[PDB]
Structures are given as structure tokens and as C-alpha cells.
Amino acid sequence: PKVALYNQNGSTAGDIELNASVFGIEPNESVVFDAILMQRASLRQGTHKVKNRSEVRGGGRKPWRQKGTGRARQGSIRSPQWRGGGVVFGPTPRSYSYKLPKKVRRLAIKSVLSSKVIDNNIIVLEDLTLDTAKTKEMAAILKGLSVEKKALIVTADANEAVALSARNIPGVTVVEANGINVLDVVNHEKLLITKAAVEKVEEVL
Amino acid sequence: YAIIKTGGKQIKVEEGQTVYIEKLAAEAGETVTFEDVLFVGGDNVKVGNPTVEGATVTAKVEKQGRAKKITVFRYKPKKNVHKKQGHRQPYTKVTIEKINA
Amino acid sequence: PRVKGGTVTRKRRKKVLKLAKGYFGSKHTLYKVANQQVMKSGNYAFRDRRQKKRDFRKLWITRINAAARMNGLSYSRLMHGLKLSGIEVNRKMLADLAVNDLTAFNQLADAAKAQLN
Amino acid sequence: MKLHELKPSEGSRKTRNRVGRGIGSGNGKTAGKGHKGQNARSGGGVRPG
Amino acid sequence: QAKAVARTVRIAPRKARLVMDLIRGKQVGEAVSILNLTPRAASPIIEKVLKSAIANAEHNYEMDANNLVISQAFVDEGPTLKRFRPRAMGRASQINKRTSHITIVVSEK
RNA sequence: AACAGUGGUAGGAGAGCGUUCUAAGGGCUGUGAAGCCAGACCGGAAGGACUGGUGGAGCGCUUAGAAGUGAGAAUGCCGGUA
RNA sequence: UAUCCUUGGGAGUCAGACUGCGAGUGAUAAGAUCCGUAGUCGAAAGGGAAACAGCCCAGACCGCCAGCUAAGGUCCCAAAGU
RNA sequence: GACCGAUAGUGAACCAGUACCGUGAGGGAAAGGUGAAAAGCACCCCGGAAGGGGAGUGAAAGAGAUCCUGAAACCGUGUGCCUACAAGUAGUCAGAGCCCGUUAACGGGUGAUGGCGUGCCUUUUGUAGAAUGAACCGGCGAGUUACGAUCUCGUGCAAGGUU
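^ inputs. structure came back:
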């Protein structure tokens, strides 16, 4: 928890101490797995329906008398084995979301953050000020920081100004300090964190 | 020619021919020798459980093989009993030289 | 999602169909029956793979008996005489090879006869 | 972690038992419910007491 | 090598074949005579297609009428016209009004 | 390495194979994918490759997830042809 | 010799047949019915009894153009002793 | 939209609540795909036409009005081997002869002749069964979901856990 500090133009200042209780924690493989799975499942809206036998606009009459005919003894026209359809045990509108314990979710977020810290892909960027909405300014910022792949940036106050600049380029996300999760962290492989948000998340956790 | 017990079943062999035989422990380039020879043929030396002294039969072995597939399929009718099992029998190629008598 | 009956069924059926070439007419063309015969083919293949051992043994015994009878000696007496003359690890198949190299077979039969008494 | 080597807590996962598909997994024709009993028919259970 | 096809002429393929098979592989100038003399349902259709086949020489790659012989020819089934014939006790039996594809392939020898 | 065992209906237990979509990583594809057709290849099996022909734009692999996930029979339904 | 007991999760079985042996009913009739006991089949292929589930011998994890045997058998069919 | 992709999805992607059936209430279908652009076949020959053969367009005419792909049943034409003194759940294991030459391997096709051998499924103590079901091919077609309960397993905390 002694990662270096970085400026807008890549200049590095004296490193910053981080709460070991949040960033030095040994990551929990399994808890991180379930935490990922959690909202990965809850995100889907799960809207699907297929017309069961009862609601296929038809059926009704016995197609032919029970006995005295060379055909199979049958029921209404809209029945599962018939071509007319009517599915059996099909999908149904249902939610794919649940809840996890407070301790578990806190441990998950702490674990993923500490995993990033030990992998040394965290980059603390104090005071991500920006005077304009223009994207190529922040593209130059990322180039100066050598941020090539996906990334996430959190800046709490400059979110209003910086979100417009960042949102298009090119799949990077701007989130607020309260918006951290497990997928939004893991998926982006590079976390940009402003010092105000450092201590804010530190206090929250 | 001669008769060589080898892998639990004796075989007739002759100078220079090639034979397929159950897997030996030898490498795929080295020579090997058989020991329990009987009925050395031609001059037809022979004894019961023959101690044909020094008549171990040398041979060169170059292959490590695996026979063509037997699709062992078993079923018992009207009983929903199936069993299908692939099988390749391993083997080794040989060529005989310097029969000893 | 919905899983449609794709290529899996066609591959599965065509495997047995190609496996059952050479069969008489519809048995090499219709899956409903071609499947039945290959199963029967499997059972027969197994049982015949075990039969061939005993049938070749029978053939070998017949040849040895003929060779012995043409030298004043029954097959059973020949085998007995060999056993007592020594452990004749030499056996049926290679004894037939000796029969078709008959002079060697006679060179064993005389020894067996001599030691039989 | 990264997503592309997700591995669960081993021993905390089990595939469903898809009864009534083929013979190789057992529970084939009968679906593991015997022969022609009242218990063998849909909704064929009885009051628990 | 020259080819012709009838492409769904209205005639049953079995009835076509029964008269078609006899002209197979015999010199065309006399096969035409054989078939226009034998009285059958499909004989006129077949000589028409055969005459088209041999006539594919004028605005065509050249051949000669003599030393000309059918090389190989056969009959293929075409789309069939379904029809329901009424029948006693409201049974409503079905009948097939078949159709056939004729084809000639003539060569030199 | 040693020793022992490995018929099997109703059943119980475990190992897996394949299919459709979804995420992450990788990349295959008009220098011809999918699908189809033919091969004398590979695995213990479910199965999987490789080489040709057709075809003319899409698609495997890797780990995990969720299932309208696997048909030979039901005098099954529909379509086609004997 | 190493299978026994306790708790807990999940079953199917409630139509059984024949062959010895000891009985019932029957006429000490039945491939009859109902019991006890042992075996096989049920759920077990292989060799024998011509063909055969229950009779005899005997248990199939696969491959071998190895050997020894069990019941049964050795004049030909048809392996082995006129 | 970790919903379907023309037997699906609304009965209805298409002149469908239509054709059709019924006196009437009412029941109730099938049927998507040329090509990028019609550039959709000038002209010639057989033909009465249909339909063909050429020629031309186009990346493809095998793309020509079910017109992208075009599986199987089914129907044909050539053919390498075999077959008119032999009865065969049609195979398998031996096997001569003839033919061919492969994802090169103790190869491929056919097989005169010998041994063995009564399909599959259900239901039954028992089925080759003269008990039942399948004319054949293709598609579709059956133990799921919700809410609770219980048990095993895996997790975070633990005399606390938990919204």
C-alpha cells in the first residue's frame, strides 16, 4: 500500500500510503468469483415467454371420436406433439437476481482492489482537473500515462466535466466514487483513481 | 528356421524375415534377442524343453505399433444394455538375423 | 434460448450408415434397420472373435491327426508320447507347420514312438 | 482475477441430473421411477401423511 | 456429343421408360423408324426430342446425319400433379398424374 | 511397485461427450466461413480432427455461465416418397 | 476371514417361475395351487442335454492363428481311442 | 432483451381470421429467400406450342421465375466383382479367385465355399415369438419454473447471523 503518485502530464510525486485494511488484504479467489457471478447474472433482464398449451388460440373440440377410427386417439389440435404447437416447460418471465451478505460484498470489493494493487496496475492520479469537454485532451492524458488497454477512471468531483470527454474514447468508462463494483473494476484491467476518491472510498470501506 | 516362444505363444521364424509380435520392452531402434528357442530346424537339433546352448536368436526391432481398431460392441436384447469399447492392441515389428544353433 | 435439431443428428445417423456399407439393400440404406444390423454385427464380431480360436485349434488337431495316422500312430498316442518324451512346448500350429514340412514332423513322430515304449 | 480464467470454489458446483435421456446415464425409459406404479405417473404422488 | 431434354413433358415415367429402353444404343436413323412405327403413348414425344437432338447441328457445332448413334439416354421423374378422385362412401381416394423429364445424348461413331 | 477386482434388469453414486446463446482472452474467415457430399485418420465412449468436391458470408478455440440441450418406437403430428 | 452396527440423503420392489428335498389341497394327477428349505433364472452370456430360462458344468474388463481342465464325448456328420 | 428466426415466433412475416368446412353458433389452414443492379435471356436452330440446344448478360445460367444451400426416403443410367442344384433375421469369422491402389497400413471393393447365428421396442416369471408398435425419410415431440421445506457440498462471519 505504497503505490506511487502521478500528475496529469505523467510527472510522479511522492508515493501515497493506502489503507492496508482495504488494499493489502489477501484477495479471496472464491468470494471474487461469486461476486462477479452475482451482478453478472442480475444484469440480465430475463424477459421471455412461450405460449403454453392453454393459450394457443384454439384447441377445444375433440378432433375425432375416441374409438372406431384408424388414427391415434387424440385431444385438441393445439397439443405438444402436434405441428400446431404449444410448447411444454418453456421459458417464462423470471428474475435472475438475488442478494449477498454485506460482509461478503465488502470482502469482494476489497479483494479485487487489493488484487489490482499487488499486480501493480493501480495508478493514483491526484486532482484530475480538466477545463473542457474535449476528448483528445484526455486521450493525450492517457497516452502520457501509457494507458493502452481498457481502463476505469473514478474522479468524484470532475465527473461532471470529465465524463463527456471520456465516455466515447474508446470503451473506457468514467464512474463516480460510489459506482465501483466488481465487474466494472475487473473488466477494465487498469484503474485510474484520484486522491480525493482514494480517501473517500477508504472512508466508505 | 526356428521356433521362438516369445509372448506366451510360439512362432516359426526364419533368417531375415519380419514378424509382428506382442509389445516388447525394447526401444524402437535397438537389437533384441529371444532365448527360449526350440527345434532349430534344418539340421533339426531338438530336445524336450530344449537347452539349445547359446542358441538365443538375435533380432533387430524397429517399430512401436498399435493395431487397427476393434470396435467392441456388446448388447443384450430387450434389456437396455449397451457397451461400446474401442481397442488397439499394441505390438512391435521385428526382423531376424543370425539364427544361432 | 432455443436449441434446434442441427447437424448433430445427421452426423450421428450417417456414421452408422457409412459403417453399414455392403449390406443387402435396405439394410445398407435405412437407419431404422441399419442400426439394428450393426448392433448384431457387433455381437457376432465379438462372439466370432472368440470362436476363431477354437476353430483354428480344431483345424490344427485335424491336420496333426492326419499326419500321425499316415505314420502308424493315432493323434492321442502321438500327444501322449510327445509329453512323456519331454515337455514338447512345441504345439499345434507350429506342429502343423512341421506337417507341411512333414520330414520334421516324422522326425518328431519317430522320437515319440520310440519313447512311448 | 481476470474473467478469462474464472474458476469456481471446487466442490460448490454440480451439473443437473437430466433424467430421462438415453440409457447410458441410467434413468432411461423409466426415468428412474419404476414400472407402472401410481408413483410412476405425473402428479401420481399421495398425501404426505 | 449433343444433348436434349424435355423438362416435364406430361407422361408417366414408367410408361415412358417401357418404350424408351428399346432404342438405347442403336443407330439413330433407324431407331427413329423403329419408334415411329411402334405404337405407344410416349413414342411421339420421344421422337420429337430425338429429332431435336439430331437437329442440334444446324445452328450448332457441326455433325453429320450418317455415322451418328445415340450414346446414352434415360428418363427422370418430374414434379407430379396431385389429384383427389371421388370414391364410394366419401373415401376421397388420391391419384398421381405423373410427369417426366426425357433426355437424349447423341454421339458419333 | 505389489495384491485384488472389473456379467447385470429395477435402482443409487461418480466421471465425462456434444448442442444454442451469453461474458472475458486469444484469432479463423472472399488467398472461400457456415452448411452439405466423399475419404483407407485420432480417442476408452459419447465423439474430434485432417484432405478433397460443393457452397458463397459469416465462425471455431480457451475459461466460466444459462438452458426450449441430444429420439427409434407413443395405432404420435406435419411434409415428402414408396 | 473382514464384514458388522448407529445416524443421515435417494430408491425400486408387493404378478414370480422351475428343479431337488419335507409336507398340505388334489385321486400322494397335472408345466396345478399353497408352504419350508437349497439352487438357477428373474437380472447370466459360454460348453453340454439335437433345437430349450429355469437340468449338468461354469461366470464374459479387452486382444492373442497359446496351454491345462469341468459336464459331455472320441465310427462319419463332428474334435478326440474302430 | 444470455426472447423466436419461417413445423419456430401471433392462427396470420406472404392481400388471414382469407381460402375451405358447417344451415348456425363456430371451426380454421398452407404459402418467406433470382440477382448488387433485370442487366430477366437480342439473335439462330428442333418444335404447333411447352420444352430444349446454341449465342449474350452477369462474379456465378449447375442463377432462368419454389429462383440462395439443396440432405434422406424414392426413382434412373453406365459400369469393377459375383450370381440359373440352391432354400437361410441376410450378418459376422474363416476364406481362394478377380479387380483397384490409401488420411500408407500387419491396404480398399467384390467375394465361390465352411463354422455360428430366431430383428428392434414395450410388457412380462417367460417373447424368435402365432402378444403389442413402427410402410420408409426429414423435422417437431416429454421430469422444468416460481414460492417454501429439508439434507449434502462451498463460501463470509461466527455465540451470533441477517435484512
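Helices of chain E lie at 13-20, 28-37, 43-55. Strands of chain E lie at 2-5, 68-77, 81-85, 93-97, 100-108.
thumbs up if we can close this ticket
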